[PDB]
Amino acid sequence: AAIPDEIARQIVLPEGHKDNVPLFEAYRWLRENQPLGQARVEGYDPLWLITKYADLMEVERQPQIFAAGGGEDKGSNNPILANQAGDEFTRQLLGGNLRILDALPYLDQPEHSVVKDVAFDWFRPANLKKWEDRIRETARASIDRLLAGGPDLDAVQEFAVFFPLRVIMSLFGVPEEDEPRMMALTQDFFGVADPDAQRDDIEALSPDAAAQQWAATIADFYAYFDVLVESRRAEPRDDLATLIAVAKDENGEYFPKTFAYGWFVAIATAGHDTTASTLAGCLQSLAAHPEVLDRVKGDPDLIPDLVNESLRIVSPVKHFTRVALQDYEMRGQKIKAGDRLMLLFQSGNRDAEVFDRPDDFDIDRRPNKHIAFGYGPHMCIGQHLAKLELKVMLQELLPHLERVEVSGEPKLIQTNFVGGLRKLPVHLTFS
Ligand code: HEM
Ligand SMILES: Cc1cccc(Cl)c1
């Protein structure tokens, strides 16, 4: 049978993500009662909900079977779950397809492979170590402002959002003065279905509002990054913006400007917001588990284990979709050619078959098997930079904190996609 209506809506509708408790309960009910079923929500394509850790890996490691962008028919699958009216808007705007960015999530092999190889080396851990000092200096300046601002704040908008964005913008070689513009467009981009993040230039109540907001935000990013691409092509620098802007194909021709824009959009949004969310979720967890803060201050070598458990628990990238290019049997279910799948990375990270007491914050999981960065050739290119940023920040921050207290109501971004806290009122005790 189809998944029960209210379980399916809890996970498919952005509104279903506004509170973590009933969302994660719907996850768990599927893992325990219907681990691979089809959600048939009004206004949405039918979706296989991939709730199980083993199934996430099985799908992600077979891109010849489970495409992101629809394989040879490029843009016939939207790798980010829009509603039907939204996908219809995009096909109207683009002329019959959904490939609204040339960013990695929209690509299939072998194009995905060729484009990813532009930055693969740049993002490897050994190649990121040359940035560690500059990242640590950014952390220290952010912590200086935290300590100066006093102990009562919103740990998200008044702290956690700034460090990750300044790291990315510094790696682009883009001036600090442009950070507020990038922050605002990031909000427009991940807030397409959040009630407090509606753009002034879109009809908020239209059945395709989210898709119109996604398109409008991309057009604003294109305008900004066109100036950057042209600038770095004309005057190359030792920065990430240059690597992206000057990239050439096997024929010695520039990649089309949209491939640079796609990298720039991905790194200027998902390249910092996910970091911000994990750092804020980590502080929220330290408030609930003061003994963990004590322990990590006593043994700073525990910080990477803290990072890994915060990544598992927060899992701020909730899903990507795939399309079956052929019939495929998994967990006694018959997935048909053309069926879409919704990969639930947060659910995989609470799979009791993999994690003992999966809802418990436990930094002593060694190894911490989390799939917060996904899997397969699309596995997060920025995983090493995310682990480095979070390690460096916590190394510099945690000595300064004796206690975190949540003093007010946490608020999550209302999204089925890239979510996490937008507000965490705290009272900090400093050492
Ligand atoms: C806590 C931080 C982060 C988390 C949890 C996270 C999680 C994810 C996940 C789940 C995906 C999808 C993987 C899949 O399809 O199987 C992804 C993709 C990606 N992430 Fe991250 N990410 C983080 C940080 C970053 C950073 C810092 C950057 C870059 C500076 C980055 C760049 C990307 C890009 C470009 C993609 C698309 C990869 C592809 O489709 O091949 N991410 N991330
Ligand atoms: C999570 C994620 C990764 C890359 C691009 C986007 Cl829009 C979002």
- The tokens for 325 are 């290019």
Report which of 345, 337, 327, 323 is spatially closest to residue 55, judged by C-alpha positions. Answer: 345
Amino acid at 159: F
Distance, CA of 7 to CA of 236 (rounded, Å): 51
E-assigned strand segments in 59-191:
66-67, 152-154
Peptide bond connecting 358 to the previous residue in cis, omega within 30 degrees of 0: no
Return the number of other C-beta atoms located less than 10 Å from residue 316's C-beta: 26
- Look at residue 252 and give its three-state secondary structure: coil
Amino acid at 84: Q
Convert 243-257 to b/e letters by CB count within 10 Å (16 or more is b). bbbebeeeeeeebeb
- Look at residue 208 and give its three-state secondary structure: coil
Return the number of other C-beta atoms located less than 10 Å from residue 283's C-beta: 24
Distance, CA of 274 to CA of 271 (rounded, Å): 7
Report which of 41, 127, 112 is spatially closest to residue 74, judged by C-alpha positions. Answer: 112
Report which of 266, 361, 351 is spatially closest to residue 307, judged by C-alpha positions. Answer: 361
* Angle (deg, nearest 10), helices 179-190 and 209-234: 150
Contacts of 365 (CB under 8 A, 6+ apart): 305, 308, 309, 312, 355, 356
Q: Tokens 């053309």 correspond to what residue? A: 338
Distance, CA of 366 to CA of 364 (rounded, Å): 6
Q: Is the CB of 105 under 6 A from ligand 2?
A: yes
Lining residues, ligand 1, CB within 6 Å: 60, 104-105, 116, 168, 266-267, 270-271, 274-275, 278, 311, 316-317, 320, 345, 372-376, 378-382, 385-386
Contacts of 135 (CB under 8 A, 6+ apart): 167, 388, 389, 392
Report which of 375, 320, 318, 317 is spatially closest to residue 342, judged by C-alpha positions. Answer: 320
Distance, CA of 278 to CA of 106 (rounded, Å): 25
Distance, CA of 304 to CA of 387 (rounded, Å): 8
Q: Give nearest CA residue, ligand 2 atom 8.
A: 270
- Is residue 430 a contact partner of residue 402, using CB atoms and an 8 Å limit? yes
- Is residue 22 a contact partner of residue 38, using CB atoms and an 8 Å limit? no
Q: Is the CB of 413 under 6 A from ligand 2?
A: no
141: DSSP letter? H
Distance, CA of 271 to CA of 288 (rounded, Å): 27
Return the number of other C-beta atoms located less than 10 Å from residue 426's C-beta: 24
Contacts of 294 (CB under 8 A, 6+ apart): none
Q: Give nearest CA residue, ligand 1 atom 6.
A: 373
Distance, CA of 198 to CA of 176 (rounded, Å): 25
Distance, CA of 425 to CA of 173 (rounded, Å): 32
Amino acid at 5: D
DSSP β-bridge partners for residue 335: 328
Ligand 2 atom with the smallest distance to the CA of 317 is 1
Q: Is the CB of 270 under 6 A from ligand 2?
A: yes
What approach was used to elucidate this structure?
A: X-ray
105 CA distance to ligand 2 middle (Å): 7
367 CA distance to ligand 1 middle (Å): 21
The Cβ-side half-sphere exposure at 250, using a 13 Å CA radius, reads 5
Distance, CA of 298 to CA of 286 (rounded, Å): 14
Report which of 276, 267, 275 is spatially closest to residue 173, judged by C-alpha positions. Answer: 267
- State how beta strands 340-343 and 47-50 pair: parallel
Q: Is the dihedral of CA 298, 300, 303, 305 positive or negative?
A: negative
- Is residue 48 a contact partner of residue 335, using CB atoms and an 8 Å limit? yes
Distance, CA of 68 to CA of 298 (rounded, Å): 44
Report which of 230, 199, 235 is spatially closest to residue 216, judged by C-alpha positions. Answer: 199
Q: Give nearest CA residue, ligand 1 atom 9.
A: 373
Q: Tokens 């900090």 correspond to what residue? A: 428
Report which of 170, 168, 86 is spatially closest to residue 382, judged by C-alpha positions. Answer: 168
Q: Give nearest CA residue, ligand 2 atom 6.
A: 266
- The tokens for 184 are 């605002």
- Is residue 170 a contact partner of residue 178, using CB atoms and an 8 Å limit? no
The Cβ-side half-sphere exposure at 261, using a 13 Å CA radius, reads 18
34: DSSP letter? -
192 CA distance to ligand 1 middle (Å): 19
Q: Tokens 């879109």 correspond to what residue? A: 202
> Could you tell me how many residues make up the chain?
431
332 CA distance to ligand 1 middle (Å): 31
DSSP β-bridge partners for residue 254: 248
- The tokens for 72 are 């040879």
**Start-to-end CA span in the chain (Å):** 57
- The tokens for 37 are 């079923």
- Is residue 398 a contact partner of residue 297, using CB atoms and an 8 Å limit? yes
Q: What angle do CA 178, 181, 183 make, to 5 degrees?
A: 105
Report which of 379, 313, 321, 375 is spatially closest to residue 350, judged by C-alpha positions. Answer: 313
Resolution of the experimentally solved model in angstroms: 1.8
| CA of 217, nearest ligand number | 2
Cβ-based burial of 73 (10 A; exposed 0-12, middle 13-18, buried ≥19): middle
211 CA distance to ligand 1 middle (Å): 21
- Look at residue 142 and give its three-state secondary structure: helix
| CA of 311, nearest ligand number | 1
- Is residue 13 a contact partner of residue 59, using CB atoms and an 8 Å limit? no
Distance, CA of 110 to CA of 149 (rounded, Å): 50
Q: What angle do CA 191, 197, 201 make, to 5 degrees?
A: 105
Indicate the annotated binding residues for heme b: 112, 322, 375, 378, 380
Q: Is the CB of 383 under 6 A from ligand 2?
A: no
148 CA distance to ligand 1 middle (Å): 33
- The tokens for 34 are 């219907």
Ligand 2 atom with the smallest distance to the CA of 380 is 3
63 CA distance to ligand 2 middle (Å): 18
**Dihedral, CA atoms, 97, 95, 14, 406, nearest 10 degrees?**
90
104 CA distance to ligand 2 middle (Å): 8
Indicate the annotated binding residues: 112, 322, 375, 378, 380
